[PDB]
Structure formats: structure tokens, C-alpha cells
Amino acid sequence: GPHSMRYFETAVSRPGLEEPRYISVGYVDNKEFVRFDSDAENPRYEPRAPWMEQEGPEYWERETQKAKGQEQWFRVSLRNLLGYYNQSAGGSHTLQQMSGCDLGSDWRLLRGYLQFAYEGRDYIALNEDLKTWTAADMAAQITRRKWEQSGAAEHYKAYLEGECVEWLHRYLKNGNATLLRTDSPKAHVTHHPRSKGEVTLRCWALGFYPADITLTWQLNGEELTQDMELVETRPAGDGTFQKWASVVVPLGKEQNYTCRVYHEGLPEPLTLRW
Amino acid sequence: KGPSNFATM
């Protein structure tokens, strides 16, 4: 049982609006548990899972203050970036950040993350060593040297190995049956008429969590990259996910076709047919 | 709990 935490943060400026909007969302094991939004009437971190209500008022106040700090940070960085790319006034601009930690099943730190994007594109990221920086862009090199000069990495590294890990542990305790759980996929195959002498077989997987899943079709062993049709995994909107894969099959040589569903929540992969 | 960032960009 591995775990993770992330914060996803965004500042967005728009031609007219006077100062940026800043949003931060926290996840535990890929599920949103906290959120902050400067557009709100009274901007504060808010719980986004029941088990976060446990946290007392000081937690919220202090996180709230840190958010206001992040907002100011993004605001200045946006203004700096505008200059590094020689962008004029009059456009919209975006700065995003992903941060957090992965733990193994033993709850020890597997890996820290710290990554930034500007206009939706990789700007600078902290390497896995939590010591050196990747920055592709010529403009991005000004930041890399600035952050190398200031020993930024050691500080992020301390956050990732320490506070990030320590608070995730606490969260994992505070919500133990809300994260410990997966829902297995319920799968069925539907039948649709088609061109003369041909039918579309649609293998559905429903009601699963987490979202990662794999669907395949076999003509008795042989998988099919051959114009097999699918849809991107999508939310039911109730916290599970949906996905289907379909294929075209000679009407009445249809029984020769089996679907398989791969998902973590499964005792083992499913095999399904009309 | 999230990062509190250091040197600006």
C-alpha cells in the first residue's frame, strides 16, 4: 500500500483583471482533500474531504496564511516571467506548480516532486536527487542560476523529506478507511448492429476507483491494436470512473472474442464475452 | 500541508 500527496497550484492573469487569481488544491492518494481560492469572498483553505474536518482552527489559519504567501510569490514570479520572455501587456498568462511526495508501502519517502510550468509548458523542475534543477528554456536559465545561487533546492528538499512526509503520515492516519479502499470494476459487453454482416462489441468497465485501468480484446490470444476503439477514462461524477473499448466483429463469428479488464482492485484480471 | 516557496522566479 503506497501513498502520495500533491499540491497543485495555479496563478492566472487575464488582460484586464488587475491582479492574478491564485488557486491551490491538495491531494492525498490522488484525491482532493484541501483547496484554496483567492476569488472566494473570504479566501481560506477549506476541507474537501470529511476526514479533514478533524483539523482544528489553527491548522486552517496557518495554511491560509501560507496560501497568502504563495499568492504573493506567484504574483511576483508572473511579473518576472513576463519580462524574461519579453511579453507585452495585454495577454493572459499562467504559472503552475506541482509539489509533493511519494511513499512506499513501508511509508518511507520514495521520491519528492517540485515542478513548475509557464503558459502550460515545463519551465523548471527539481531533479529526483532533490539537489539539481532542470530548465530547458533559454529564458528559464535566469531562474535556474538565481535558485542555484540562493540554495533554493536544499530548502525544498527539507520541505519534501520532512514536512511533506510527516504531514502525509498524519493525514493517512486521520482518514484510514477513506483512502485504504479501491472499488473493483463491474464489466459487461454490449452489442450494436453495424454495416452488413458486422457488429460492434463494446466492453464496459463501470464503478471503479482509482481511475487507472486497462481494457483489451483478444481473438483467442491475440491482442488488438488494430483500430480497436476506446474512450478516455472519465468520472461517473459520484467518485468512480467509466471506460469502454469496442471492436468490429463478423456477425456470427462473434463468440471468438474475449475482453479483459486490468485493475488494481481486482483479485485478478477479468475475462468477459458476449 | 503544501510548500512554502523560496526565491521567486
Partner: protein
């Protein structure tokens, strides 16, 4: 640079004519995050459509789930219409109960 919205329109539960259900419009992979999503029933904007809050994926692209109560019938057509800077005109996609 602009990333154009991918759009899926589909129901929460397997559709049954006359049975109350929920209709999703899942818009993904777009940038910048500003976006307008309408849901339509027989070509008329549906009043009270819920919109999830701004999120983005590990590839940095944004995504949004719009959804609304509906009862499928034989004859009613449902559609999602998305306006985004990446596209010259609004993109409409029609609900297909088999997908």
C-alpha cells in the same frame, strides 16, 4: 500556446428511457483554463448546470466536469457546447446513449 478541449458527453448510470439520471460533459486537455461550457436539451440551454472547480493534470492541461439532472427519452437530443479560445467557433457534441 492553446490546447483544444477534448469533449465527452455521457450519462452517470446506464440510460433507461424515463429513468432519472445524470448527464456529464467531461472537457479535458485544454489551455488556457478560461472556458465556457453549456449543456443543451433539444438545442435549448439547460438552466442549472453544475460545474466542477478548476483542476489540472500532471501534463499541466486543465479539465472540468459539467453535469446535470436529466431524464432520457426516445426523442430528446442532449448536447454539450464548449467555447474556448483555441477554437474559432463553439464546438457541439451530441449525447450518444451507446457511448
Amino acid at each position: 500556446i492553446q490546447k483544444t478541449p477534448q469533449i465527452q458527453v455521457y450519462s452517470r448510470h446506464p440510460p433507461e428511457n424515463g429513468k432519472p439520471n445524470i448527464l456529464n460533459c467531461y472537457v479535458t486537455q485544454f489551455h488556457p483554463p478560461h472556458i465556457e461550457i453549456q449543456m443543451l436539451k433539444n438545442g435549448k440551454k439547460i438552466p442549472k448546470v453544475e460545474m466542477s472547480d478548476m483542476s489540472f493534470s500532471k501534463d499541466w492541461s486543465f479539465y472540468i466536469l459539467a453535469h446535470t439532472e436529466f431524464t432520457p427519452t426516445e426523442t430528446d437530443t442532449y448536447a454539450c457546447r464548449v467555447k474556448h479560445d483555441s477554437m474559432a467557433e463553439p464546438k457541439t457534441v451530441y449525447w450518444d446513449r451507446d457511448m
